[PDB]
Amino acid sequence: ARPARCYRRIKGPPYTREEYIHGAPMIQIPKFDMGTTSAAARAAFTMVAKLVAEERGQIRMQALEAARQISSKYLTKYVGDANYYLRLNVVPHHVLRENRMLAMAGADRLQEGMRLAFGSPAGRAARVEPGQVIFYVEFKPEHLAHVKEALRRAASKLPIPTRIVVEPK
Template identity: 45%
Template sequence: MHGGCYRIGNGQPYTRKEFIKGKPQPKIAKFQGGKRGEYDYIVQLCSNEKMQIRHMAIESARLSANKTLEQTTGETGYFSVLRIYPHVLLRENKMIATAGADRLQEGMRRAFGKAVSLAARVNQGQVIMEMHVRKEHVEAAKKALAGACVKLPITPTIKVIQAKAS
């Protein structure tokens, strides 16, 4: 299974997990990291295009960003939130790929396939992940999210928003 086959989400997403035996579990360990609190800025990772992102890529990006920022600010110097959830089931109809397989199997039209992975559908401009940081750590958060961009199948943009003063 290649990630390139599942980047573009055409058709209606399939999310009915109750009908599938042996459904895959999301690989995302935590959706929030760091310490909640009052922060000056929110640094967001936003999508530039409509795409499907697999749960393994989301988890990899989250780990990369959190680890980079934690080294700079410490465990209590930031708060990160994942804003997407992998609901969409990705299915694959596996074919026999050995010598002489063309005589054994020609495939089935519109075959259902076996559930192999999960993905999140992301629209253009949608926030994928955000980091809440203090003023002195804004550049470190931008660098951490830039490192997380490498793990994703899209080229997202990084926005810096001043948090509301209360």
């Protein structure tokens, strides 16, 4: 994988129609909603924290997965799976491309340089706008310090600056 700065900016149209894309990669995020997901038990939670994007850009699938792991592990350890609801709010629909010389990927991929430059699929990313919610947490007011810490850890894994907004439901 290239450094994430290579795919951070929105430089072209969304590339999502998988029926026209050969070898589009499979999404490598196993779950998107963590903790207590049933709507009845979520009624106990009365606070909402959001990790909100500050800039527009593309977040790679592995960064979303890395952010999801660190925050969910922290909440499981310190808050408890029965006392919170955490949702990864964006889905990596956009397919990333790379122009590299490769074997077993088509004859055109054997031409070097910028000849036949249209890249083969290299991964997935979510295209986000300023103010967009990346992570969404529902919790009880007693755990505010722990929820803020979990979202601070998630933010350290993401390629764009974010900010934490805490509001009641």
